[PDB]
Design a binder for this molecule. Structure first.
Ligand SMILES: *C/C=C/c1ccc2c(c1)C(C)(C)c1cc(N(CC)CC)ccc1-2
Length: 133
């Protein structure tokens, strides 16, 4: 479906450290990030999205409109400027972040009460699965 609204709890997280390493996140912060519980909160109204990723320590919040490029500064992650764009490819929500890192972005598949997320950077893919709370 195209409705991603909800509070989403992580169930699976494959190659998180490889994806973070591809982004040049410090080895110490990677250490901590792998241990934290991650909660993904999505507020969606039409083409307007507010996405909030929260853990004990760090937060990552982004707002966007589908189909409208936006400048992004990944202040709480790898601290880079990217030109981001989120679009629908069928019922897959696709984000491309143009900038230094090649093949950067993410894709979201919503299937019932499950959310599949694939984060890409360079040649690394992190695959995550969330269940709706
Ligand atoms: C549709 C989802 C997009 C998206 C953008 C940014 C991040 C995520 C999902 C998370 C939840 C996978 C995530 C986790 C982290 N941490 C360090 C690796 C823990 C807070 C940072 C940024 C994003």
């Amino acid at each position: 479906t195209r409705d991603a609204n909800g509070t989403w709890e992580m169930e699976s997280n494959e190659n998180f450290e490889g994806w973070m390493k591809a982004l040049d996140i410090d080895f110490a912060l990677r250490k901590i990030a792998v241990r934290l519980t991650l909660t993904l909160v999505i507020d969606q109204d039409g083409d307007n999205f507010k996405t909030k990723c929260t853990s004990t320590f760090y937060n990552y919040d982004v707002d966007f409109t589908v189909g409208v490029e936006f400048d992004e500064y990944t202040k709480s992650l790898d601290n880079r400027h990217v030109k981001a764009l989120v679009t629908w490819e069928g019922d897959v929500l696709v984000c491309v972040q143009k900038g230094e890192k090649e093949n950067r972005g993410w894709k979201k598949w919503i299937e019932g009460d499950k959310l599949y997320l694939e984060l890409t950077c360079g040649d690394q893919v992190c695959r995550q699965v969330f269940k709706k709370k």
